[PDB]
Amino acid sequence: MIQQETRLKVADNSGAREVLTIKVLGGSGRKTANIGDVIVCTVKNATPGGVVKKGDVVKAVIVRTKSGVRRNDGSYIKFDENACVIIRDDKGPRGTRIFGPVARELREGNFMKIVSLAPEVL
């Protein structure tokens, strides 16, 4: 349940530290996003000397949310935050590290460098 004007923390080392969403990608009239989905974004806060700086427009993946996801077995997974990881073509990051935990749905989403770098999948 991630929309326009949501600020998401950033779970990589690309330089971005807080990020604001613009449009959710996937189709027309798409109101919200959720884990595994891609978003356009902008950087409202960046770490000094970061690769990705303030006011740069950029895509990203939603990695973890509070409005978590349901699985077919009835198991749910939620979090205590909302987080992004910043990407380009080829569904992989322009950073090199990932912070905190990550969900499994990115496997189905073919975000495999992310899953491999994530210290804990859940």
Partner: protein, 114 residues
């Protein structure tokens, strides 16, 4: 009861293997996942926030902190995917829904054992 027919239909889906636990206590959950290759079994060691529901619709959610990030993994109690449930402590708790832990992290999230 719930209903003389509901119960008699959904009896077979139950599980009597499992222990008696309460919200407060640190337990493990040997989940039987199916990763895209094969079946592995990863464990989710955390404290139980809550249990609700009656019958096959019974649930329990567990909370672990991985790397400062709070995780909240909900389950149906009667899954076939839960191969095993181990129990470590029996925490002392004056409530049944420990939602006050979601705002607390560190020394304040400590549950006292009996």
């Amino acid at each position: 009861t719930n209903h003389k027919l509901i119960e008699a239909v959904t009896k077979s889906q139950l599980r009597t293997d499992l222990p008696s636990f309460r919200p407060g206590d640190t337990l493990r959950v040997h989940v039987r996942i199916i990763e895209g290759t094969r079946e592995r079994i990863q464990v989710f060691e955390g404290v139980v926030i809550k249990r609700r529901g009656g019958g096959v619709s019974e649930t329990f959610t567990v909370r672990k902190i991985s790397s400062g990030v709070g995780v909240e993994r909900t389950f149906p109690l009667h899954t076939p995917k839960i191969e095993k449930i181990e129990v470590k402590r029996r925490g002392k708790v004056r409530r049944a829904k420990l939602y006050y832990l979601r705002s607390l992290r560190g020394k304040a999230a400590r549950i006292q054992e009996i």
